[PDB]
Amino acid sequence: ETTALVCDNGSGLVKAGFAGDDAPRAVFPSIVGRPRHQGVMVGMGQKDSYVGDEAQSKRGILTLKYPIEHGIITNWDDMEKIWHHTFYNELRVAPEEHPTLLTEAPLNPKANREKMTQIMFETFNVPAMYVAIQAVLSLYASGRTTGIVLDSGDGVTHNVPIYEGYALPHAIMRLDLAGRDLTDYLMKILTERGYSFVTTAEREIVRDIKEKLCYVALDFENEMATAASSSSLEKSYELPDGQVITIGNERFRCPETLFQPSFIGMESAGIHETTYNSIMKCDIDIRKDLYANNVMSGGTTMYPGIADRMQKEITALAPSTMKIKIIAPPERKYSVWIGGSILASLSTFQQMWITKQEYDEAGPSIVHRKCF
Amino acid sequence: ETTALVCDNGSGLVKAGFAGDDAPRAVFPSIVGRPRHQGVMVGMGQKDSYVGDEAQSKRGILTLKYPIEHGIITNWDDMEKIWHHTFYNELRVAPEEHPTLLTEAPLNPKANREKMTQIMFETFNVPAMYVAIQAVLSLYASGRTTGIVLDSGDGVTHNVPIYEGYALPHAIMRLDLAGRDLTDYLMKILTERGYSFVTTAEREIVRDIKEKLCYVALDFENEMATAASSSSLEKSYELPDGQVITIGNERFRCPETLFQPSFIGMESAGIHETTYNSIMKCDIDIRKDLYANNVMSGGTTMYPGIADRMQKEITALAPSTMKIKIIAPPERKYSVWIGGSILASLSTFQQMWITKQEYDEAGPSIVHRKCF
Amino acid sequence: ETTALVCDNGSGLVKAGFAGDDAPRAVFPSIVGRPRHQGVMVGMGQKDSYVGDEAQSKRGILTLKYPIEHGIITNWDDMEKIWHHTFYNELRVAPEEHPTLLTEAPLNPKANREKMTQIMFETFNVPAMYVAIQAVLSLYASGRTTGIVLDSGDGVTHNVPIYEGYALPHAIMRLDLAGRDLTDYLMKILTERGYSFVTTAEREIVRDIKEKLCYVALDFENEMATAASSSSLEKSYELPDGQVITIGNERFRCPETLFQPSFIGMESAGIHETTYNSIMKCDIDIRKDLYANNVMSGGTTMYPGIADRMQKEITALAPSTMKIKIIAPPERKYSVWIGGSILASLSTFQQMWITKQEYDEAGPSIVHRKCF
Amino acid sequence: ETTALVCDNGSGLVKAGFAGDDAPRAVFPSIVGRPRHQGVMVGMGQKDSYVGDEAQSKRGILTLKYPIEHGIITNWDDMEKIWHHTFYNELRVAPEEHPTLLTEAPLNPKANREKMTQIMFETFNVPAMYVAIQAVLSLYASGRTTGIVLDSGDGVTHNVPIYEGYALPHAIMRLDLAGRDLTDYLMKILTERGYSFVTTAEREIVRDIKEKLCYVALDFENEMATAASSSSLEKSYELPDGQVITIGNERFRCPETLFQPSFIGMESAGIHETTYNSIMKCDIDIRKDLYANNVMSGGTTMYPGIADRMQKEITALAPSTMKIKIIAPPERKYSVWIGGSILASLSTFQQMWITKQEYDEAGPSIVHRKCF
Numbered sequence A, B, C, D: 001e002t003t004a005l006v007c008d009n010g011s012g013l014v015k016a017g018f019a020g021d022d023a024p025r026a027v028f029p030s031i032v033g034r035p036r037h038q039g040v041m042v043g044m045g046q047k048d049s050y051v052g053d054e055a056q057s058k059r060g061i062l063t064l065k066y067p068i069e070h071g072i073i074t075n076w077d078d079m080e081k082i083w084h085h086t087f088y089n090e091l092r093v094a095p096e097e098h099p100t101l102l103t104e105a106p107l108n109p110k111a112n113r114e115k116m117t118q119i120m121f122e123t124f125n126v127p128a129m130y131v132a133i134q135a136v137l138s139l140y141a142s143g144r145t146t147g148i149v150l151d152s153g154d155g156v157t158h159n160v161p162i163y164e165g166y167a168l169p170h171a172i173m174r175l176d177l178a179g180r181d182l183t184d185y186l187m188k189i190l191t192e193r194g195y196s197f198v199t200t201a202e203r204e205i206v207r208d209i210k211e212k213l214c215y216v217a218l219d220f221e222n223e224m225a226t227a228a229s230s231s232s233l234e235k236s237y238e239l240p241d242g243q244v245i246t247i248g249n250e251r252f253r254c255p256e257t258l259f260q261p262s263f264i265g266m267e268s269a270g271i272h273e274t275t276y277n278s279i280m281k282c283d284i285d286i287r288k289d290l291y292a293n294n295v296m297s298g299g300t301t302m303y304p305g306i307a308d309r310m311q312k313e314i315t316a317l318a319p320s321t322m323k324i325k326i327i328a329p330p331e332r333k334y335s336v337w338i339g340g341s342i343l344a345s346l347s348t349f350q351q352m353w354i355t356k357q358e359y360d361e362a363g364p365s366i367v368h369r370k371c372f
């Protein structure tokens, strides 16, 4: 039919589904794995490459790799496999019949977008296309028109102030702190005890450990003193092989580098100061409205105590006269996809498509004159 | 019905209302604003131009401009929008059924008046018209027949001696000092401290600051010495963003340039000497009556200590034999409109209109033979 | 040597030169200018006052003022500077060696003449002095003995009937219309269009414009109708800044107030009626000779069509029996100086001087018993 | 000895030298750097702070900061270190024996100047002091007395009209566009390709890239079309690590925001319109002389095609009658210092000093009554 499709692929996660719904239909990690050992059976295996859930299921004898890194595609041959798997082995749909909507982080090379649209038009033969900023759809999902948006995932962390539909492009900030840095720091600090992890499967195990038992401390020094004094903060985790591990003060030291980037050697400011700097670069009249409409989205902002910690950090910098409010919906993980699905079903979003006639009459460089 | 309308369109404010009343019905600034940033929403806004209170409400993302400057219309395309908004979105009246009265400052180009009447007749199709001098209606509002009138606003400052209904046109003086010059000087002298304002919204903020905390010192040198010695004259103001500012001796240095125009580089005499020069150019017999019937009107003359300061300045120049009196009614801000409403309801003011038959039989150049 | 000097100091010009010649040697305006802005250079200028041509050359940063007003000296400290500049920086002569002749308008305060002679004797130490009426020397320059003389400049306009060397002092009329009033009226009526002039330098520019493009219309109503119908009377002028201006019917409306003083608010009669009234106050027998010997002098009478207009105006009032003739020499501008130089070289004009012995034996009040 | 010293401390560079010379003796950037990495050696370094050339030499392990920002000193503890290094480690002179001359941009807080003189007198014990406007010394260096001066550096851009030594303080304009904004915009637009720079050392690298390969296009649209068509404008640069980078149309897009401030979000007019507005606010008589004596100074005006571009822009606004000339000496970078050295050696500049007796008899607030 004419129903549009939404595919919000990320640094390490891909969510695809039909438009007009309220939840993604296919969510799976974007990894590609190949075997490394020798095959001795008459079959010696079945295939030479695994993409999707089966790659992680058989990760014990595979070398997993991520096509996308820091939000920029580096391997242009695995993305074709991933998109083919998404379109055929996950949705069972013919791409030559439905429009496709894609999302991309701001401040990225134009060659990436041009190659993306060129290989999307000339390989899958979709009849329409559009590329939208990830953080813009967060306001659509929330149902607002003004407010600064913070989005964090496996890629980059970026802010964009929007006021009554007129976004300011001269106050957009972008960082390079994400889940991969957090799990690498957790892997490094886990070597402090006897545990050691070097393999990609062990990297996935450490990622799962970070997802399960982690939180953000309201006060770092007091939490450190309590952990060193009472030693009642320890948790227990069970490895697949059967052994158990115990972690104490490392639980709240993993998200701390998100607020103090000096832990991993980066020279920058935390997420509490970047938002304040972005706010103070806007106009004087609209500062008050943005201060009381903070919006949070993305998986990385799913930690328990992030909201109170960020509110406390922001309230110190801002003047005491006004109020600071942070909006953290419980379903903020699948927020970009919901906004994209809402946008794709609008009545006025019908002449904003990029038809194939325009593409093959002008060229791949048309995406720079029709998308923000 | 046949009720007339009065529309006093000043250089920085517009006041419109029906005749026969005692207070304007619609008072709003005359500014036009357009957006400058980019729209990213599916709506990207609603309109492309804002005129009236909504333009100032959304001034954070707009570029505000004034159609009228120094009392002379420079943009003839925004005045149509402003008058349409006044007639339709403020009064909810049909212009083709009621006469309209307009005010204009003396000593202005005739092309301005001719274009005004030409576009008022041929676009809104009013059945009558009349243009009257702004300072003449001040006497009507006061309820007198003799006395020199001083009017100051956002445009020009002009005096016109009137004695028993026979005004003298050879003793009319006009200056170019108004609220815009005062707020520009305040903006310049505010850079003396750390505060800096460059944007039009910041210009409006400075105008509000001038309106709130300003006064006129009786003695400049003594006030300067007191401010430099005791430092008890400082006031505090709160910016919209939340920050606070403090102003000391700058409070009484803003209206000082009205009495000493050399501060802003102009080579002229203050308002205390212009009135004396205008009085001394009249006849010997009527000098005494004009000296004891000073009349003040306009917003710019709303400062606290202006009356005593001007009386003290005038008494020094005039001979000590007679008396000098200054009349400053508390409602002098809406003085021209009250006089116009009083004049438009008079029984003898019925054959002085400019009917459409005369206009389309003679031409737009008839306004020079029926209005003073 | 013993050669006399002649110094005609008018209300707006100074002409000085040696006696026995036929043309003034030094002609320059009588203005004094002082700076108003701040000096930031290590020199910050050279002097604190400029008098003569250099004052007008640097008029952009000076405040020009005229010592003489309406023919009466008001500033007695700038006249010393002007006369010192004339005697030393223009003629390179020692005043203590040559007699000096001065001119003064009739019907002036005696204190002015007494102060003039007192400060001329006691400061420059001239050995002789004489003061003569300006309009008397016009007949000497023309070479006649009977005829009414009309003189107009930047000061006052005065008539004096003279018949065979016996002037009648009871029929002398004096007005107060001059070039300053004409240029002020031109400045006022130039505000009718977009052009506006307020500064003294702009006053000089308007004076130059009046000097260049002005004339007198023979018939006012017909000229007005022609200007309003054909619009072929417009001229173009170039301002120093580079902009151009256009003037139409204002060309012949500037000298009209000389014939109809009601334009500038004055209540009097034009120059055509003052001469007739002066003639009709004389004796019956000498009326015919004065009617046919009109004499014109002064700069203000240098307009193109003044002679024919005045002849037409006079012929209507006078009886049709006799003839009316007006004498307007092409060199009438420097007419008083020529007459003074002719008078100072006469053989019988040697015992009419005012020696220093008489001055210091009688007093400054001797000038009233030796000069007319 | 009694030889004076000149120390021009800009927003990004410091130039100091003895008076009476023709070239600065010590030119070095004004940055302060501190280490941020751990020290493991028995020395762990030598010092804790680096100021001058050594700070930039070891910039790989330091955090560089600028004490001055937008022309206003923000860190009052690093300026003491910088001035001590200048006086002792660069010139090898005792400050208690020589007078010192300092320069400061116009329209700055008075507290800055008062603190500067207070800490210069009470810490280094200099026997004399004077503060002069930066743009005034440009005329001294050129050797003129009239002409508008444009100065641009790392701080602010300001114009001041001067005519025969009488500067007009009511027509002085000041902007906030400088080299820092240009290099920030270049850093932002370099992210369009794969290159990314976030560190202060990378900021210095981008500044060097801007200094080396940049120019101003005469026509923006034609240059854009040529760059997009031929692609022959690309240049190559070599990074310290060994990699090479290529830049195409970004070469002429960096100085474009100096003429169109809307690129970086600022709401103002380019340098071509600010000069015209400043000229048109002066007097009518002096407009022609200022138009034909444009003066350019400062490092930011060192771009190749700036002169022709600015002349073309100005000629369009100005009337076609007169001529527009721009003076751009090849040594305009060290123009303020040359003018200061010329001024400090003048014979009349000996009683204009601020002796210590006046300072300790009156107070730090004396600098407002002796310097412009």
Ligand SMILES: Nc1ncnc2c1ncn2[C@@H]1O[C@H](COP(=O)(O)OP(=O)(O)O)[C@@H](O)[C@H]1O
Pocket: A008, A009, A010, A011, A012, A013, A152, A153, A154, A155, A179, A180, A207, A210, A211, A212, A214, A298, A299, A300, A302, A303, A333
């Ligand atoms: N409950 C949780 N607690 C902590 N971290 C989480 C949680 N859920 C998800 N994450 C983190 O969020 C990341 C997923 O982000 P994602 O939504 O895929 O961003 P994108 O779609 O831009 O790639 C994972 O790397 C994971 O570390």
Ligand SMILES: Nc1ncnc2c1ncn2[C@@H]1O[C@H](COP(=O)(O)OP(=O)(O)O)[C@@H](O)[C@H]1O
Pocket: B009, B010, B011, B012, B013, B152, B153, B154, B155, B179, B180, B207, B210, B211, B212, B214, B298, B299, B300, B302, B303, B333
């Ligand atoms: N209370 C006040 N104190 C000082 N200034 C005032 C006050 N109220 C109004 N004004 C000044 O008066 C001006 C408004 O003049 P206005 O009445 O609009 O004149 P016009 O109608 O001729 O435009 C404003 O610019 C403002 O600066």
Ligand SMILES: Nc1ncnc2c1ncn2[C@@H]1O[C@H](COP(=O)(O)OP(=O)(O)O)[C@@H](O)[C@H]1O
Pocket: C009, C010, C011, C012, C013, C152, C153, C154, C155, C179, C180, C207, C210, C211, C212, C214, C298, C299, C300, C302, C303, C333
């Ligand atoms: N060609 C001309 N056309 C019109 N007016 C002129 C002309 N030449 C001079 N004038 C006027 O004559 C005046 C000079 O008069 P002047 O001879 O100085 O009288 P006085 O010597 O008594 O001061 C000037 O103000 C000027 O306006």
Ligand SMILES: Nc1ncnc2c1ncn2[C@@H]1O[C@H](COP(=O)(O)OP(=O)(O)O)[C@@H](O)[C@H]1O
Pocket: D009, D010, D011, D012, D013, D152, D153, D154, D155, D179, D180, D207, D210, D211, D212, D214, D298, D299, D300, D302, D303, D333
């Ligand atoms: N050859 C050049 N090309 C382009 N820009 C230059 C060149 N030389 C210097 N600059 C710029 O000039 C600036 C230095 O200005 P400077 O003379 O230090 O001003 P100030 O002395 O007021 O700080 C540097 O930031 C640099 O970007």
Ligand SMILES: [Mg+2]
Pocket: A010, A134, A151, A152, A153, A298, A336
């Ligand atoms: Mg995401």
Ligand SMILES: [Mg+2]
Pocket: B010, B134, B151, B152, B153, B298, B336
């Ligand atoms: Mg008004």
Ligand SMILES: [Mg+2]
Pocket: C010, C134, C151, C152, C153, C298, C336
């Ligand atoms: Mg004369």
Ligand SMILES: [Mg+2]
Pocket: D010, D134, D151, D152, D153, D298, D336
């Ligand atoms: Mg500089």
